[PDB]
């Protein structure tokens, strides 16, 4: 087509979606990771994660307001990945990289799994 | 912080949100623009438009599944802006610029209003 494109649009959209999350506006699901609860927007979760895409395209699961993750999932790892979904920024540290990578494999977030593998390889 | 950032994340999120819209997945509102109907995600509309942000933060309107726009709004102008919300690309043409600018003013989409004003000024 002959469209023009606003470079910062996608980043500005994501910033606004994170502001809605902050303010608990139109959040429609609670993700439970053992004793912790995280409120989010199903569409943002599906857009970032192959696991959430599969869950919320299921004709029964699409209607659930609570999703319980596998008990082996680390709440801090999930929190770091949820923040990445809404900001593009990943708080990857020596102390959390193993939990973050395991969580990203489970959630099916291939680009995160990729940077974790690279950071681990560099320390070996 | 000491975060790393994935450059293409925001664009990839928006591309996936547009794929959900295409496939009518988890759309939760119908926008009516006279005889036409457009299905969308409230969160994407709020993230792009000051008018939708005000509508869906209202304690009563947040629960509506149908929103009727002012009868003066042009359906093609709205369609072009809805596509821009989900793609960052604006199909601005000599034949639609007046309707697009009027619709963007109504929807409170300041960057679109800005490029329309500039394109109009260049033709004068």
């Amino acid at each position: 087509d002959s469209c023009i494109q606003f470079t910062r649009h996608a980043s500005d959209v994501l910033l606004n979606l994170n502001r809605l999350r902050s303010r608990d506006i139109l959040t429609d699901v609670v993700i439970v990771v053992s004793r912790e609860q995280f409120r989010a927007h199903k569409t943002v979760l599906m857009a970032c994660s192959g696991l959430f895409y599969s869950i919320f395209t299921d004709q029964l699961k699409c209607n659930l307001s609570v999703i319980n993750l596998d008990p082996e999932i680390n709440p801090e790892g999930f929190c770091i990945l949820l923040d990445f979904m809404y900001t593009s920024r990943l708080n990857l540290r020596e102390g959390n990289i193993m939990a973050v990578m395991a969580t990203a494999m489970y959630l099916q977030m291939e680009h995160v799994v990729d940077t974790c593998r690279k950071f681990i390889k560099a320390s070996e | 912080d000491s975060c790393i950032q994935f450059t293409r994340h925001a664009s990839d999120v928006l591309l996936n949100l547009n794929r959900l819209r295409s496939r009518d997945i988890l759309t939760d509102v119908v926008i009516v623009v006279s005889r036409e109907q457009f299905r969308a995600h409230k969160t994407v509309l709020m993230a792009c438009s000051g008018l939708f942000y005000s509508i869906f933060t209202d304690q009563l309107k947040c629960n509506l599944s149908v929103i009727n726009l002012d009868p003066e709004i042009n359906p093609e102008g709205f369609c072009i802006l809805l596509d821009f919300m989900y793609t960052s690309r604006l199909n601005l043409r000599e034949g639609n610029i007046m309707a697009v600018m009027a619709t963007a003013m109504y929807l409170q989409m300041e960057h679109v209003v800005d490029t329309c004003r500039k394109f109009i000024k260049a033709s004068e």
Binding site: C3, I4, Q5, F6, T7 | R89, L90, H111, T115
Partner: peptide
């Protein structure tokens, strides 16, 4: 704004 750019030409994509």
């Amino acid at each position: 704004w750019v030409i994509p």
